[PDB]
Each structure stands twice: as C-alpha cells, then as structure tokens.
Design an enzyme around this catalytic site. Structure first.
Site, PDB file in Angstrom:
ATOM      1  N   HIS A   1      -7.184  -8.928  -0.659  1.00  0.00           N
ATOM      2  CA  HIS A   1      -6.842  -9.347  -2.010  1.00  0.00           C
ATOM      3  C   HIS A   1      -5.424  -9.882  -1.959  1.00  0.00           C
ATOM      4  O   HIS A   1      -4.721  -9.735  -0.951  1.00  0.00           O
ATOM      5  CB  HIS A   1      -6.951  -8.175  -2.995  1.00  0.00           C
ATOM      6  CG  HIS A   1      -6.011  -7.067  -2.669  1.00  0.00           C
ATOM      7  ND1 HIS A   1      -6.298  -6.104  -1.722  1.00  0.00           N
ATOM      8  CD2 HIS A   1      -4.758  -6.804  -3.113  1.00  0.00           C
ATOM      9  CE1 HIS A   1      -5.260  -5.285  -1.616  1.00  0.00           C
ATOM     10  NE2 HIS A   1      -4.322  -5.689  -2.450  1.00  0.00           N
TER      11      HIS A   1
ATOM     12  N   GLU B   1       4.918  -8.471  -3.231  1.00  0.00           N
ATOM     13  CA  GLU B   1       5.299  -7.084  -3.464  1.00  0.00           C
ATOM     14  C   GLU B   1       6.454  -6.695  -2.551  1.00  0.00           C
ATOM     15  O   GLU B   1       7.507  -6.246  -3.018  1.00  0.00           O
ATOM     16  CB  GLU B   1       4.087  -6.184  -3.241  1.00  0.00           C
ATOM     17  CG  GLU B   1       2.900  -6.576  -4.129  1.00  0.00           C
ATOM     18  CD  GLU B   1       1.997  -5.398  -4.411  1.00  0.00           C
ATOM     19  OE1 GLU B   1       1.503  -4.792  -3.441  1.00  0.00           O
ATOM     20  OE2 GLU B   1       1.807  -5.057  -5.601  1.00  0.00           O
TER      21      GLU B   1
ATOM     22  N   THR C   1      -0.142   0.210  -3.214  1.00  0.00           N
ATOM     23  CA  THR C   1       0.789  -0.281  -4.232  1.00  0.00           C
ATOM     24  C   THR C   1       0.183  -0.352  -5.617  1.00  0.00           C
ATOM     25  O   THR C   1       0.842  -0.851  -6.547  1.00  0.00           O
ATOM     26  CB  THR C   1       1.315  -1.667  -3.883  1.00  0.00           C
ATOM     27  OG1 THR C   1       0.239  -2.592  -4.018  1.00  0.00           O
ATOM     28  CG2 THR C   1       1.875  -1.703  -2.473  1.00  0.00           C
TER      29      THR C   1
ATOM     30  N   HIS D   1      -3.034  -9.063   1.210  1.00  0.00           N
ATOM     31  CA  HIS D   1      -3.170  -7.723   1.770  1.00  0.00           C
ATOM     32  C   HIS D   1      -4.561  -7.611   2.379  1.00  0.00           C
ATOM     33  O   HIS D   1      -5.567  -7.777   1.674  1.00  0.00           O
ATOM     34  CB  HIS D   1      -2.940  -6.637   0.702  1.00  0.00           C
ATOM     35  CG  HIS D   1      -1.508  -6.483   0.306  1.00  0.00           C
ATOM     36  ND1 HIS D   1      -1.113  -5.827  -0.836  1.00  0.00           N
ATOM     37  CD2 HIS D   1      -0.362  -6.881   0.919  1.00  0.00           C
ATOM     38  CE1 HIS D   1       0.199  -5.845  -0.934  1.00  0.00           C
ATOM     39  NE2 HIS D   1       0.684  -6.473   0.124  1.00  0.00           N
TER      40      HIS D   1
ATOM     41  N   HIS E   1      -7.556  -6.383 -11.897  1.00  0.00           N
ATOM     42  CA  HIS E   1      -6.195  -6.299 -11.383  1.00  0.00           C
ATOM     43  C   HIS E   1      -5.884  -7.389 -10.379  1.00  0.00           C
ATOM     44  O   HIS E   1      -4.754  -7.879 -10.334  1.00  0.00           O
ATOM     45  CB  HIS E   1      -5.953  -4.947 -10.695  1.00  0.00           C
ATOM     46  CG  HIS E   1      -6.577  -3.783 -11.402  1.00  0.00           C
ATOM     47  ND1 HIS E   1      -6.258  -3.438 -12.701  1.00  0.00           N
ATOM     48  CD2 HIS E   1      -7.486  -2.870 -10.985  1.00  0.00           C
ATOM     49  CE1 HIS E   1      -6.955  -2.373 -13.060  1.00  0.00           C
ATOM     50  NE2 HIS E   1      -7.706  -2.006 -12.035  1.00  0.00           N
TER      51      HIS E   1
ATOM     52  N   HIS F   1      -1.611 -10.542  -4.388  1.00  0.00           N
ATOM     53  CA  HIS F   1      -0.729 -10.329  -5.532  1.00  0.00           C
ATOM     54  C   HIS F   1       0.052 -11.610  -5.739  1.00  0.00           C
ATOM     55  O   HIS F   1       0.503 -12.205  -4.761  1.00  0.00           O
ATOM     56  CB  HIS F   1       0.263  -9.198  -5.262  1.00  0.00           C
ATOM     57  CG  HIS F   1      -0.399  -7.910  -4.900  1.00  0.00           C
ATOM     58  ND1 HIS F   1      -0.713  -6.955  -5.845  1.00  0.00           N
ATOM     59  CD2 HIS F   1      -0.861  -7.440  -3.717  1.00  0.00           C
ATOM     60  CE1 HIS F   1      -1.306  -5.934  -5.251  1.00  0.00           C
ATOM     61  NE2 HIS F   1      -1.405  -6.205  -3.963  1.00  0.00           N
TER      62      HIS F   1
HETATM   63  N1  LIG Z   1      -2.254  -3.405  -2.688  1.00  0.00           N
HETATM   64  S1  LIG Z   1      -2.673  -2.396  -1.448  1.00  0.00           S
HETATM   65  O1  LIG Z   1      -3.130  -3.134  -0.314  1.00  0.00           O
HETATM   66  O2  LIG Z   1      -1.585  -1.540  -1.093  1.00  0.00           O
HETATM   67  C1  LIG Z   1      -4.136  -1.299  -2.106  1.00  0.00           C
HETATM   68  C2  LIG Z   1      -5.389  -1.263  -1.435  1.00  0.00           C
HETATM   69  C3  LIG Z   1      -6.480  -0.446  -1.926  1.00  0.00           C
HETATM   70  C4  LIG Z   1      -6.329   0.340  -3.090  1.00  0.00           C
HETATM   71  B1  LIG Z   1      -7.529   1.241  -3.631  1.00  0.00           B
HETATM   72  O3  LIG Z   1      -8.732   1.359  -2.964  1.00  0.00           O
HETATM   73  O4  LIG Z   1      -7.459   1.899  -4.840  1.00  0.00           O
HETATM   74  C5  LIG Z   1      -5.086   0.312  -3.764  1.00  0.00           C
HETATM   75  C6  LIG Z   1      -3.997  -0.505  -3.273  1.00  0.00           C
HETATM   76 ZN   LIG Z   2      -2.316  -5.162  -2.404  1.00  0.00          ZN
END
Ligand SMILES: NS(=O)(=O)c1ccc(B(O)O)cc1
Ligand SMILES: [Zn+2]
EC number: 4.2.1.1
Length: 257
Positions: A91, A103, A195, A116, A61, A93
């Site tokens: 990570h 996002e 998200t 993020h 992803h 996006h």
């Molecule tokens: N994209 S986000 O930072 O909101 C995020 C972080 C972790 C997880 B997870 O551990 O599944 C999902 C979304």
């Molecule tokens: Zn994220």
C-alpha cells in the site's frame, strides 16, 4: 473510529491505542549523519519472481494490493532479517501536495509518497500471529518523488477508478511488484511499529535510500480516491500519513558505507 482528519487523526490515536506513545513507534526521521554503516548486515534478498497478486481493496485508509501468501512465493530475506518473510500486501501513503506524503523523512525531508511492502516472518505461521511478536513483520519502505512516470505503477493507477470508495475491491492478478523497486537496494534499518492502529511494535523497518520517480499525473490519480464509502459525503483520500515519532534509544543502521 481512527482516521486522518482533524478530529480522528494521528494525534488522537493514543487515546484508543496507548502504544502510540511507546518505545519503538514508527515512522521516524532518518538522520543520515547519525545512521551508522553496519558491516554485520548480510546482503538483502528480494525474491519476488513468483509473486501472486490477487486483489486490490480500498479499506478507507489506503488501498492494499493483496498477495497469495499461502506459500513462499514472494519473500524478503537477508539484511537485518533472520529467516524468511512472506509478502502479504503493499500500500501507499501520500499527501495533498508533492511536498508531503511520506511517513519516514530523511533529514526532515518529506517525500510525495511512500510505498510499504509488508512481509511476515514464516516462523510464526500466519500474519495474525506474527504481529504479536517483536520480529514478526518486515516492511520495505520506498520513497516516491514526482518526476518521470513509473511504468510499473500504471496498472495500479488504471484500476483506482474501480475502487474509489471505502470497501470497494477489484480483481488484481499478475501484478509484478518488482516494477516498483528503485535501481539500488541500499537501505537504512531500525526496529519500529505499524504506522496505523493497532500500531503494534512488531516491525523491522527496511527503508530504501533511493526513491522511485512517479509522474504528477500518477499521484494525481491517487488523490482522486475517497476515504468515505459509496453514497456518503466525499472526502478525498489524501494526507494518509503519520508524522515522524520520537526515536528514543533506537539506532538506525545503514547498509551502505
Ligand atoms: N503502514 S505499515 O506498513 O506500517 C502497516 C501495515 C499493516 C497494518 B495492519 O495489518 O493493521 C498496519 C500498518
Ligand atoms: Zn504503511
């Protein structure tokens, strides 16, 4: 399972994750003219001096840079937060083109990408416990625009060739996340969710106003990653962003007047 294609993307997620239609989903559009300066916000404290990265992983992803979170080594404190939040991973996006990828949006403006930095509240003992709580997570969001190169990102860029496909990982030690921050830490904050599935409503979002600039060549290397695993039909990892969700009755607070 879930992804970002026409047939498993964000508009499908609510079928397996009904909270996708919940009351504090993220991301959201940040209306800069409606977010109110909050004088009750303590100063924000990013303490990454002793951050210990371990690994970088393509999870099909995005890619995660993972940190040693067994001690209070890289922590976020202050601002809207009560207590200590430990950095566990970061990570990005990003989009297929520079006009989309982020996002969160700012007055409906979409950035080329969004970083993020994911932190969990130490009072809950571990990440898996924290995501079960309304104040379990703090995610620091940083917009990327295409301009000059970000030198502190180049170590990330250079290793992506070794984690092209889903499930690949590589050693990633001595990376300093402080090189990814903008000059100013002015931010907006609101209560929201992860998200990506499970979309749990456990996040205090802290979104920095000032983007960082990255080069076209740098984002180009992001777009060379693959959603698929090795030996499978190739899908470029692009447009791995969820669009803005309804704000509902939530208020976005600004740390700057
Ligand atoms: N994209 S986000 O930072 O909101 C995020 C972080 C972790 C997880 B997870 O551990 O599944 C999902 C979304
Ligand atoms: Zn994220």
């Amino acid at each position: 399972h879930w992804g970002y294609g026409k047939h498993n993307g964000p508009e499908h997620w609510h079928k397996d994750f009904p909270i996708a239609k919940g009351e504090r989903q993220s991301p959201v559009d940040i209306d800069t003219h409606t977010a109110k300066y909050d004088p009750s916000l303590k100063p924000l404290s990013v303490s990454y001096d002793q951050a210990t990265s371990l690994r970088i992983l393509n999870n099909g992803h995005a890619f995660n840079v993972e940190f040693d979170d067994s001690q209070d080594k890289a922590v976020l404190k202050g601002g809207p937060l009560d207590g200590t939040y430990r950095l566990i991973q970061f990570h990005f996006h990003w989009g297929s083109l520079d006009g989309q990828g982020s996002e969160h949006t700012v007055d409906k403006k979409k950035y080329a990408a969004e970083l993020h930095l994911v932190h969990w509240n130490t009072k809950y003992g571990d990440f898996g416990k924290a995501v079960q709580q309304p104040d379990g997570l703090a995610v620091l969001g940083i917009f990327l625009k295409v301009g000059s190169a970000k030198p502190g990102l180049q170590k990330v860029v250079d290793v992506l060739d070794s984690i092209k496909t889903k499930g690949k990982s590589a050693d990633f030690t001595n990376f300093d996340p402080r090189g990814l921050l903008p000059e100013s830490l002015d931010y907006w904050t609101y209560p929201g969710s992860l998200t990506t599935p499970p979309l749990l409503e456990c996040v205090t979002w802290i979104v920095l106003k000032e983007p960082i600039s990255v080069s076209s060549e740098q984002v180009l290397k992001f777009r060379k990653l693959n959603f698929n695993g090795e030996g499978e039909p190739e899908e470029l990892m692009v447009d791995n962003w969820r669009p803005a969700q309804p704000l509902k009755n939530r208020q976005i607070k600004a740390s700057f007047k």
